[PDB]
Design a protein around this ligand. Structure first.
Ligand SMILES: O=C(O)[C@@H](Cc1ccc2c(c1)OCO2)[C@H](Cc1ccc2c(c1)OCO2)C(=O)O
Ligand SMILES: [Zn+2]
Ligand SMILES: [Zn+2]
Ligand SMILES: [Zn+2]
Length: 220
């Protein structure tokens, strides 16, 4: 028995969902993703860890009259894709990049029903932008921009106190990737990390500092 799923308003039309998992040697891990409202529609930014919480998330928005139009996962790890299987079984479109789908497949996992290419896919014209700053936490990590409110979902790429799980990271590339993101999204009002609470554009600079640090460290 783990803590319950949390759903809270962050701004008009934007909610943070928080799920919790007991993984490895890190004890219980909070994971944040978003739900973005589009008139009568709701889009998921990352899924909870699990089918059961993913179903709880949808039921909470469906039962208020919001039909789930779709989901996008920011990278292949299960804290961003654990609910794709369930979603596909309820005929809710799911999205990921071609590379993210390749990594899922390689890993024996269910793929997103919909794929995209490019550094800048627009899931919802002028409302939900996906952008690829380069490798870091993983080769495929992408970020999700929300232009109406200027909120950036940074996923597991944003790490203001230390880089986290390095099993699939590219530490040699992370600083470069961090500087591009720091520039493209310098006018973010709020920045949303996967495993830290919500910050401002400062988190883009702390992450850059941590990546440079970690690389220095790697050299010994
Ligand atoms: O790599 C990640 O995405 C998580 C590791 C993780 C944890 C739970 C899981 C999982 C993968 O798949 C299914 O359940 C990792 C979480 C983490 C761990 C330690 C940290 C941390 C984040 O930030 C600071 O210290 C990260 O994002 O870096
Ligand atoms: Zn990850
Ligand atoms: Zn993560
Ligand atoms: Zn939180």
């Amino acid at each position: 028995s783990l803590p319950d799923l949390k759903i809270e308003k962050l701004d008009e039309g934007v909610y943070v969902h928080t799920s919790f998992e007991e993984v490895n040697g890190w004890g219980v891990v909070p994971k944040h993703g978003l739900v973005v409202l589009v008139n009568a529609e709701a889009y998921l930014i990352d899924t909870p860890f699990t089918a059961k919480d993913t179903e709880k998330l949808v039921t909470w928005f469906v039962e208020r009259g919001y039909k789930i139009k779709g989901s996008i996962s920011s990278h292949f790890h299960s804290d961003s894709t654990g609910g794709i299987e369930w979603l596909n079984s309820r005929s809710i479109p799911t999205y990921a990049s071609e590379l993210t789908n390749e990594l899922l497949k390689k890993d024996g996992k269910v793929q997103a029903t919909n794929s995209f290419s490019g550094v800048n896919y627009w899931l919802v014209k002028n409302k939900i932008e996906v952008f690829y700053p380069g490798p870091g936490h993983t080769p495929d990590n992408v970020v999700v921009w929300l232009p109406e409110r200027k909120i950036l979902f940074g996923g597991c790429f944003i790490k203001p106190y230390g880089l986290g799980n390095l099993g699939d990271a590219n530490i040699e590339a992370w600083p470069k990737s961090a500087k591009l993101l720091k520039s493209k999204y310098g006018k973010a009002k709020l920045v949303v990390p996967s495993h830290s609470e919500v910050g401002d554009a400062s988190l883009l600079k702390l992450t850059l500092e941590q990546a440079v640090k970690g690389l220095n460290e790697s050299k010994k």
